[PDB]
Design a binder for this molecule. Structure first.
Ligand SMILES: CCCCCCCCCCCCCCCCCC(=O)OC[C@H](CO[C@@H]1O[C@H](CO[C@H]2O[C@H](CO)[C@H](O)[C@H](O)[C@H]2O)[C@H](O)[C@H](O)[C@H]1O)OC(=O)CCCCCCCCCCCCCCCCC
Ligand code: CLA
Ligand code: CLA
Ligand code: CLA
Ligand code: CLA
Ligand code: CLA
Ligand code: CLA
Ligand SMILES: C=Cc1c(C)c2cc3nc(c4c5[nH]c(cc6nc(cc1[nH]2)C(C)=C6CC)c(C)c5C(=O)[C@@H]4C(=O)OC)[C@@H](CCC(=O)OC/C=C(\C)CCC[C@H](C)CCC[C@H](C)CCCC(C)C)[C@@H]3C
Ligand SMILES: CCCCCCCCCCCCCCCCCC(=O)OC[C@H](CO[C@@H]1O[C@H](CO)[C@H](O)[C@H](O)[C@H]1O)OC(=O)CCCCCCCCCCCCCCCCC
Ligand SMILES: CC1=C(/C=C/C(C)=C/C=C/C(C)=C/C=C/C=C(C)/C=C/C=C(C)/C=C/C2=C(C)CCCC2(C)C)C(C)(C)CCC1
Ligand code: OEX
Ligand SMILES: [Cl-]
Ligand SMILES: [Cl-]
Lengths: 48, 48, 238, 187, 449, 48, 242, 99, 49
């Protein structure tokens, strides 16, 4: 599994998931705390 | 999709090539091309 | 899974299922072997398949035996499409000839202890002499890599710098075998074969084989290791 | 920097891509985008041209003296090719290897003869044209095609080769190579 | 035309001023539909004006003639062009309908009624009239199902469609007995999107394509009558946000996923996008190069089963990690490619050795050579080949251009969906401008964060 | 035999060995045998 | 004033001047790039070779310090940012001069190895004729190559050093000594006494120039900050708010 | 503080650090190119190149970069340095298999 | 540091960058090949900043 590069696919997939969840959470906390949720719009460029 | 490709795009009335900085980058690209993954190429054209 | 229904399934139902790395097995006939008709034969679709990959290790306390290893590559072990000519006599003395086909298999295995030993599992140009029950011989063994293979600092046999030019003083040193010359001497191996479950109706043969062959010598470096390869083989006569 | 106007509204001057050139007792078509190189290959070279993009797309002529009367005295095309194997390039690797396959023992390159020809001039002189594939063990540039043309002047045996990459052969250089090959007229 | 003060929206929010304008909203929609179909007609007519028949249509940077060819008009046995008259008829009809829709759009954008509620109750709606706007959604679903059924009937009784998978190299055919099996037809939906499976990219035959179209059309008709005859559930009301900008953001999320999936279709699918018209894929070009060099060394006397490459793994033949016999080269990474010129060459264990040694086909070899010479690889200046290659072949694949542009559209529309989605959530929360400076939630909670 | 753990200055290795942990995840056994399957309770297993 | 003087000292150390002796502070990279020591040696050969006593001898008449100066390892701009320490810890201590290598091919013309430019860490080895066209090279490909020494037949001969009048014809040793002469003159270095890594280090002149250039840039920033501080001594803590 | 874990408590320090990051970056880049001005580079890792020299299997991305850089320079010299008139032949140019 | 210090340290203005986008690209690849400017610590300091 290490020889064929499986840990790579695992880490990259989980990083994709974590980054998308992180910026959607930025949207969420801006919604909860009383902000404008374009912080997630701004993070859509590092996500991109 | 590639970037700009202005290799040998500047030629004179005699048809002799005006080597440009684009052609300098072209031959540089050959230099970093010939042996990137220097064992996995079994064909001249790299369509993979 | 016999050869009769091996062609009876399309590529869609065998893709990604490991059937393409599985030899046919003979289900009819008897294992008495002697029932096969004698004479000159031309086998086609001779198939190879390993069942165990083990690497010899000089055990520390003076012992010497083969230890089980872990296959680092995926299911890329077998070799198909083998040709050649067979002769069978009344007393049972047989000879084996192999000419071309998918006659190499580069596969790296992991030894217990974080050790990797790459090798080229080959059976090319094998001349098995003996009877139907057992017959052995010698076969050609290529090293591994081509003459033009390039290491981290170029170099190598055919193409390369012939020296590590990153160091302006490490050109003449004890590393004569590391930069000046790269060894590509082809070794020789030992193969033991046994024939079982012969179908005289369609000339189908099977059995278990044994392969002894030295591994990669990493181009004039640390000595290679002898590998014991066991598995099942299948063939079709004419 | 003398005073004359710019070239405008008077159509293009050259588009075919070939510019005539003549040397000593010979004249042929050279590519307009190719640049002659001062790297003389063999000791008997008068003219040599090459492409500025890749140095593989090169061409030169040979002005070696002769001891026979004509190339007909040299005989068959196979016998003529079999004497001039230095032009392709000798293998500098001598170690025996079987781990490359498809070639002869202790060999990493092969000369695949793609064709021969018997082309006549205006009156009676023959223009030998052949085609040789020069592969390698690794197949660099997918091999190399050797397009050779030979003739006999008053002495000074004139050979040609338009050596070019095989990727260039199917990517826009075969027609230019043929135009160079069939224009190698020696008078 | 309104100002900033009476609407609260600036010029860069101009059509925001017509969020609460049903009539001008529908007029802008009709005008924009006219714009879309006007570009359809203009693209069709421009492409057929610059269409050269002897050269392949993908070499000329043509996209829409491949679409009409997949529809099954003007082509014969082998994908060659025979008559551009249906192409002209489609483009002319698009231009005339564009004139009609543009006239309607400018009429309802200039002198159309401001709101449709007081005059036309069937067309009158707000963003909170759940039953009325679900009736509108059901009307649109029935319309789309009717369009899918039109495509189905075109494939069934109106000359059929083009199959690149047809024996001999693709032809126009009539489809019969579609794939109505539920498990087979939803296996693509429940499939993994990675390589080897590709989710719904890996649709390979027209019977399955038409069966899926029948499935989606009948289901869409059922959904339309469902939305017309029913009302959204209270749990849907609680979970959802019910503003016009919310419906806009939801549609933008849908079309963003749509565009990403369509980009993957353009870059990989060769069944719904035959390479004879759209140009070869990257997979098709790589395996074409391997096959062309294999048959070249076969015809010049070399054994492909033997003669291992510099790596010792096999220059022309290797084994897939699952064990299938595949071509040599780095093209091993593209070993899951399926194009209709290798399956006869492919046997049970993969590539059959005797098949590839003794049963070659001239159409397959010339198709592979032409795809090799025109791989989907070129510059934005339409300079062919890699970035190191000289400007001699004027070709960049429509597959590459559509994949690039459709990724642009899908990603920008994802960001637009997120934009309007955040604005929908905050505006329905009643917060579309900021904190009230006297009712800050921050100053009323506990410290330490 | 000639270079056992007490010749290598091993401190907690004898204490792991004394109570039962003899196999290792490295594919060897301190008695000179080969660990076919050491399981989860090896030296590195106990350390983790 | 002090980073003015820092730029002055960096310039005078990198270009060389009256108070910057080569004997004490090492050579300059521009002397190597201008063939200064090589030109000196070769005209010291032209004199006393044009009047008899040919290149077989009188190379011993060439001082050993001059040949040590004609070496790219003696170049101050051949090290790295982190090739740390003494030059001897880089290549070993020179023990003796083996003489100027004269290369001759199978027909008789005298070939010369191309001198390594200062900008390169590695350089290919080629053999060029008097007329300026490459006659041989160390073959990378070695396949369908017709410039290799193994087929051209170049022998190397030495004069006036530890090896004098000795002609090597073996391809491996002529390749190795051609690679050694690629760096300039030919010298033997003791390496095991200081554990030499192999790469070249930098001269004290080069390190001096680098440190003083960095210090001069930092002091330019400091002078800008102190100029702001001088003219703006009244509004540091805040502005007049009016 | 709830998203990232840390947050700014001062507009003045926020704006000054916004000033601080690119000026520090550009000044350190200037010092680096000043170091490059005298052929003093971070080119070779001595220990890694040593173990790559005595280990033909030890391939790393750093060694791949090093080899690609001498390939860069070998292709640079001829067409970028006319005053050296380096007439490097085609064969001496380092290249991999095929291509 | 890039238009005066580098040419003054090197052989001359020819190794200095030329005023032009593709010429700056040539100079950038020149530092990539000759200097390994990506692996330079001060350069990583700068790109991080
Ligand atoms: C869970 C979600 C995971 C999404 C990423 C997983 C990887 C998807 C992928 O492998 O991508 C491609 C896949 C298709 O995979 C391809 O599927 C193909 C199937 O075609 C088959 O069938 C075809 C029929 O003509 C051809 O014949 C073809 O030759 C044949 O092989 C081939 O197998 C290819 O080898 C294989 O790569 O697309 C698909 O599955 C469609 C699904 C949508 C993909 C969306 C891509 C964008 C992803 C993230 C962008 C984020 C944006 C927001 C943030 C910013
Ligand atoms: C069909 C989808 C759709 C619809 C109906 C709307 C509707 C609306 N948007 Mg919106 N938007 C969308 C998609 C959509 N948007 C997408 C996909 C994005 C990208 C993330 C945006 C980003 C966006 C922003 C930033 C804003 C709006 C705003 C608005 C409101 C006013 C718009 C206006 O008049 O400004 C005028 C419109 C323009 C001046 C056009 C912009 C010009 C662009 C940049 C040129 C692009 C062309 C170029 C060739 C594209 C190539 C890229 C690639 C495809 C190759 C309005 C109700 C505004 C708002 O919030 O008001 C409440 C506003 O701030 N939108
Ligand atoms: C394709 C995109 C599109 C569409 C369909 C619309 C549509 C509309 N906009 Mg809008 N707008 C857009 C883009 C668009 N806009 C962009 C990008 C911006 C940012 C610059 C704005 C900024 C904006 C503002 C500030 C306002 C509108 C307004 C309006 C509405 C009425 C305008 C009006 O009646 O005044 C008349 C407009 C004109 C007289 C100029 C147009 C000249 C003619 C009609 C051009 C049409 C030519 C056409 C091809 C002819 C077809 C022929 C046909 C008979 C076949 C209308 C429905 C207004 C509104 O909110 O409604 C109350 C308004 O306040 N828009
Ligand atoms: C999205 C399309 C659409 C919609 C929803 C409406 C809706 C409306 N229009 Mg209208 N219109 C449209 C397009 C549309 N129009 C276009 C394209 C034109 C240009 C020809 C017009 C020109 C027009 C005029 C001149 C008038 C209206 C008027 C009206 C209003 C009431 C009277 C009426 O329905 O007239 C009757 C509608 C018709 C006679 C058209 C035929 C209706 C059938 C059902 C069409 C069948 C559709 C069929 C499926 C084909 C679809 C093709 C598809 C592929 C696009 C009403 C709210 C009136 C108004 O503004 O009030 C003062 C008015 O007098 N429209
Ligand atoms: C694109 C057209 C379309 C649109 C916009 C809607 C929109 C809506 N529908 Mg509807 N529907 C449609 C088509 C459509 N439908 C069709 C074609 C059918 C026939 C099958 C139905 C049958 C239907 C029913 C029976 C109901 C709705 C309901 C609803 C409402 C709430 C749904 C919800 O909560 O979100 C989404 C719901 C979920 C995410 C949970 C369901 C889980 C999934 C979607 C089941 C599908 C299984 C499948 C394997 C999923 C894998 C797909 C994935 C890999 C991409 C909503 C406004 C509900 C309603 O409120 O009544 C009006 C409801 O009861 N719809
Ligand atoms: C200015 C932006 C722009 C431009 C220029 C284009 C241009 C194009 N797009 Mg695209 N698109 C865009 C934006 C854009 N798009 C955006 C923002 C998205 C969302 C991300 C999409 C999503 C999208 C998809 C999903 C697809 C396209 C496709 C296309 C191409 C064909 C158009 C088509 O036929 O679609 C579709 C047209 C319709 C749905 C109208 C109805 C057509 C009917 C149903 C046809 C019925 C014919 C019938 C069977 C004939 C028989 C009659 C009788 C005998 C039965 C075209 C070149 C297609 C493509 O090339 O694939 C990549 C395609 O599938 N686009
Ligand atoms: C239940 C959890 C657990 C388990 C299964 C183990 C298991 C193990 N530990 Mg360990 N350990 C644990 C928890 C655990 N530990 C915790 C929580 C700590 C932190 C304090 C430690 C710290 C620790 C260290 C530092 C070491 C181990 C070591 C070991 C290994 C050998 C044990 C040994 O040295 O033998 C012998 C154990 C003893 C001789 C303890 C004697 C107890 C005395 C005699 C009690 C007498 C007083 C009592 C109150 C009187 C009772 C009165 C009576 C009438 C009832 C072994 C695999 C050793 C090792 O090899 O490293 C891996 C080692 O050096 N452990
Ligand atoms: C390549 C990127 C780049 C450009 C083009 C640029 C441009 C500019 N920066 C300015 C300011 C600044 N730059 C600053 C921070 C930064 N600036 C950065 C990057 C850039 N800044 C970075 C990365 C930072 C972070 C530290 C500050 C702090 C300031 C200012 O105070 C000032 C400002 O107000 O910002 C808006 C402006 C004042 C220049 C002027 O009139 O000088 C006058 C002198 C002139 C015009 C003569 C220059 C002629 C040059 C040197 C020789 C000829 C060159 C050609 C004209 C063009 C050649 C182009 C090729 C090489 C491609 C100018 C628009
Ligand atoms: C932490 C701070 C120190 C970092 C550097 C440690 C070097 C490690 C080392 O080997 O040192 C030890 C090295 C010696 O290193 C050893 O030397 C031996 C012979 O002396 C041998 O040659 C060994 O091979 C060699 O390793 O000497 C030093 O002290 C390095 C001098 C540091 C100062 C050099 C000039 C810097 C001038 C300006 C730089 C700043 C410019 C402005 C700011 C930017
Ligand atoms: C035509 C065709 C076909 C068919 C297809 C199909 C059948 C499709 C489908 C499909 C479907 C049938 C779909 C569905 C869907 C849905 C969706 C996609 C949705 C959604 C959403 C979401 C994502 C959610 C969210 C949420 C959550 C998470 C929870 C809570 C609530 C909320 C809302 C928040 C085929 C390919 C075969 C063939 C070819 C042709
Ligand atoms: O891995 Mn990195 O570099 Ca993109 O092309 Mn294909 O793959 Mn491989 O070769 Mn060329
Ligand atoms: Cl690489
Ligand atoms: Cl490849």
């Amino acid at each position: 599994w290490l020889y064929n590069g499986g840990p790579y696919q695992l880490v990259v997939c989980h990083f994709f998931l974590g980054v998308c969840c992180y910026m959607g959470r930025e949207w969420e906390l801006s919604y909860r705390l009383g902000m404008r949720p374009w912080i997630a719009v701004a993070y859509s460029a590092p996500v991109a | 999709l590639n970037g700009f490709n202005f290799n040998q795009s500047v030629v004179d009335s005699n048809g002799r090539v005006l080597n440009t900085w684009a052609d300098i980058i072209n031959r540089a690209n050959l230099g970093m091309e010939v042996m990137h993954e220097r064992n996995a190429h079994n064909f001249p054209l790299d369509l993979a | 899974l016999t050869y009769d229904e091996l062609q009876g399934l399309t590529y869609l139902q065998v893709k990604g299922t490991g059937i393409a790395n599985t030899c046919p097995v003979v289900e009819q006939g008897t294992s008495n072997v002697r029932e096969l008709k004698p004479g000159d034969y031309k086998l086609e679709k001779f198939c190879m398949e390993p069942t165990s990959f083990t690497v010899k290790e000089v055990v520390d306390k003076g012992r010497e035996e083969f230890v089980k290893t872990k296959l680092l590559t995926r299911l890329t072990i077998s070799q198909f499409g083998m040709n050649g000519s067979m002769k069978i006599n009344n007393d049972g003395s047989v000879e084996f000839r192999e000419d071309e086909g998918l006659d190499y298999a580069a596969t790296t295995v992991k030894l217990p202890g974080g050790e990797y030993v790459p090798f080229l599992f080959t059976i090319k140009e094998f001349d098995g002499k003996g009877t139907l029950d057992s017959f052995s011989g010698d076969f050609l063994v290529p090293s591994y890599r081509g003459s033009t293979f390039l290491d981290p600092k170029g170099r190598g046999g055919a193409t390369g710098y012939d020296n590590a030019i990153a160091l302006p003083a490490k050109a003449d040193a004890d590393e004569i075998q590391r930069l000046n010359n790269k060894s590509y001497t082809p070794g020789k191996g030992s193969a033991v074969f046994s024939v079982a479950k012969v179908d005289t109706e369609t000339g189908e043969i099977a059995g278990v084989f044994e392969s002894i062959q030295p591994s990669d010598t990493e181009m004039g470096a640390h000595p290679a290791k002898d590998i014991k390869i066991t598995g099942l083989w299948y063939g079709q006569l004419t | 920097a003398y005073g004359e106007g710019a070239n405008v509204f008077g159509r293009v001057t050259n588009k075919s891509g070939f510019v005539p050139y003549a040397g000593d007792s010979f004249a042929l078509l050279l590519p307009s985008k190719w640049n002659p190189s001062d790297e003389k290959e063999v000791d008997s070279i008068v003219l040599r041209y090459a492409d500025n993009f890749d140095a593989v797309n090169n061409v030169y002529v040979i002005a070696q003296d002769t001891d026979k009367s004509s190339i007909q005295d040299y005989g068959s095309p196979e016998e003529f090719i079999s004497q001039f194997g230095y032009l392709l390039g000798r293998q500098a690797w001598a170690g025996q290897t079987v781990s490359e396959g498809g070639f002869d023992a202790n060999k990493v390159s092969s000369a695949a003869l793609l064709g021969v020809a018997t082309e006549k001039d205006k009156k009676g002189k023959t223009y030998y044209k052949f085609e040789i594939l020069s592969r390698t063990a690794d197949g660099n540039e997918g091999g190399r095609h050797q397009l050779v043309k030979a003739t006999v002047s008053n002495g000074k045996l004139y050979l040609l080769k338009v050596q070019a990459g095989d990727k260039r052969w199917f990517k826009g250089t075969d027609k230019e190579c043929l135009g160079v090959l069939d224009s190698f007229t020696v008078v | 035309g309104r100002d900033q003060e009476t609407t609260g929206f600036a010029w860069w929010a101009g059509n925001a001023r017509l969020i609460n304008l049903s009539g001008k909203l529908l007029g802008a929609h009709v005008a924009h539909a006219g714009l879309i179909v006007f570009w359809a007609g203009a693209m069709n007519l421009f492409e057929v004006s610059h269409f050269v028949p002897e050269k392949p249509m993908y070499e000329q940077g043509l996209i829409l003639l491949p679409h009409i060819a997949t529809l099954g008009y003007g082509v014969g046995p082998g994908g060659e062009v025979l008559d551009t008259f249906p192409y002209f008829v489609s483009g002319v009809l698009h231009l005339i309908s564009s004139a009609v829709l543009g006239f309607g759009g400018v009429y309802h954008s200039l002198i159309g009624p401001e709101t449709l509620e007081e005059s036309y109750p069937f067309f009158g709606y707000v963003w909170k009239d759940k039953n009325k706007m679900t009736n509108i959604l059901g009307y649109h679903l029935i319309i789309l199902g009717c369009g899918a059924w039109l495509l189905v009937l075109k494939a069934l009784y109106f000359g059929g469609v083009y199959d690149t998978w047809a024996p001999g190299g693709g032809d126009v055919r009539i489809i019969s007995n579609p794939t109505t099996n539920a498990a087979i037809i939803f296996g693509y939906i429940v499939k993994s999107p990675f390589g080897g499976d590709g989710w719904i990219v890996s649709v390979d035959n027209l019977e399955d394509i038409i069966g899926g179209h029948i499935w989606i059309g009948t289901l869409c008709i059922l959904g339309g009558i469902w939305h017309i005859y029913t009302t959204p559930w209270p749990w849907a009301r609680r979970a959802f946000v019910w503003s016009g900008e919310a419906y806009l953001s939801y549609s933008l999320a849908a079309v963003s996923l749509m565009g990403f999936t369509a980009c993957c279709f353009a870059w990989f699918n060769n069944t719904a996008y035959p390479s004879e018209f759209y140009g070869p894929t990257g997979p098709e070009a790589s395996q074409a190069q391997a096959f062309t060099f294999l048959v070249r060394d076969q015809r010049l006397g070399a054994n492909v089963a033997s003669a291992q490459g510099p790596t010792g793994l096999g220059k022309y033949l290797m084994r897939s990690p699952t064990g299938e016999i595949i071509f040599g080269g780095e093209t091993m990474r593209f070993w899951d490619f399926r194009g209709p010129w290798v399956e006869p060459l492919r046997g049970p264990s993969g590539l059959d050795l005797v098949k590839l040694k003794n049963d070659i086909q001239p159409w397959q070899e010339r198709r592979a050579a032409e795809y090799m010479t025109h791989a989907p690889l070129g510059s934005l200046n339409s300079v062919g080949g890699v970035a190191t290659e000289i400007n001699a072949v004027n070709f960049v694949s429509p597959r590459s251009w559509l994949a690039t542009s459709h990724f642009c559209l899908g990603f920008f529309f994802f960001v637009g969906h997120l934009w309007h989605a955040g604005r929908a959530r905050a505006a329905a929360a009643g917060f579309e401008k900021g904190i009230d400076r006297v009712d800050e939630p921050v100053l009323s909670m506990r410290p330490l964060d | 035999v000639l270079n056992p753990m007490w010749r290598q200055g091993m401190f907690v290795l004898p204490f792991l060995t004394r109570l039962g942990v003899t196999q290792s995840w490295g594919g060897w056994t301190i008695s000179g045998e080969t660990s076919s399957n050491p399981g989860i309770w090896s030296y590195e297993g106990a350390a983790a | 004033a002090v980073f003015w003087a820092a730029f002055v000292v960096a310039g005078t150390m990198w270009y060389g001047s009256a108070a910057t002796p080569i004997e004490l502070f090492g050579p300059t990279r521009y002397q190597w790039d201008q063939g200064f020591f090589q030109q000196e040696i070769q005209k010291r050969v032209a004199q006393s070779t044009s009047e008899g006593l040919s290149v077989s001898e009188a190379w011993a008449k060439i001082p050993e310090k001059l040949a040590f100066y004609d070496y790219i390892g003696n170049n101050p701009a051949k090290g790295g940012l982190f090739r740390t320490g003494a030059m001897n810890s880089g290549d070993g201590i020179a023990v003796g001069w083996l003489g100027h290598a004269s290369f001759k091919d199978q027909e008789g013309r005298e070939l010369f190895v191309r001198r390594m430019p200062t900008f390169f860490e590695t350089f290919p080895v080629v053999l060029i004729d008097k007329d300026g066209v490459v006659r041989a090279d160390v073959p990378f490909r070695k396949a369908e190559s017709k410039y290799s020494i193994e087929q051209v037949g170049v022998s190397v001969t030495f004069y006036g050093g530890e090896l004098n009048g000795l002609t090597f014809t073996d391809p491996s040793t002529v390749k190795k000594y051609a690679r050694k002469a690629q760096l300039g003159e030919i010298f033997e270095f003791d390496r095991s006494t200081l554990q030499s890594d192999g790469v070249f280090r930098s001269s004290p002149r080069g390190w001096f120039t680098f440190g003083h250039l960095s210090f001069a840039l930092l002091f330019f920033f400091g002078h800008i900050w102190h100029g702001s501080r001088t003219i703006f001594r009244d509004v540091f803590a805040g502005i007049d708010e009016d | 503080s709830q998203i990232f874990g840390v947050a700014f408590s001062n507009k003045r320090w926020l704006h000054f650090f916004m000033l601080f990051v690119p000026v520090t970056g550009l000044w350190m880049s200037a010092l680096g190119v000043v170091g490059l001005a005298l052929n003093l580079r971070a080119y070779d890792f001595v220990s890694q190149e040593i173990r790559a020299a005595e280990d033909p299997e030890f391939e790393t991305f750093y060694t791949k970069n090093i080899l690609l850089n001498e390939g860069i320079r070998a292709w640079m010299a001829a067409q970028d340095q006319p005053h050296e008139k380096l007439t490097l032949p085609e064969e001496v140019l380092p290249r991999g298999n095929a291509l | 540091s890039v238009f005066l210090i580098y040419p003054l340290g090197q052989s001359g203005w020819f190794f200095a960058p030329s005023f032009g986008v593709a010429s700056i690209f040539r100079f950038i690849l020149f530092f990539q090949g000759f200097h390994n400017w990506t692996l330079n610590p001060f350069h990583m300091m700068g790109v991080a900043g």
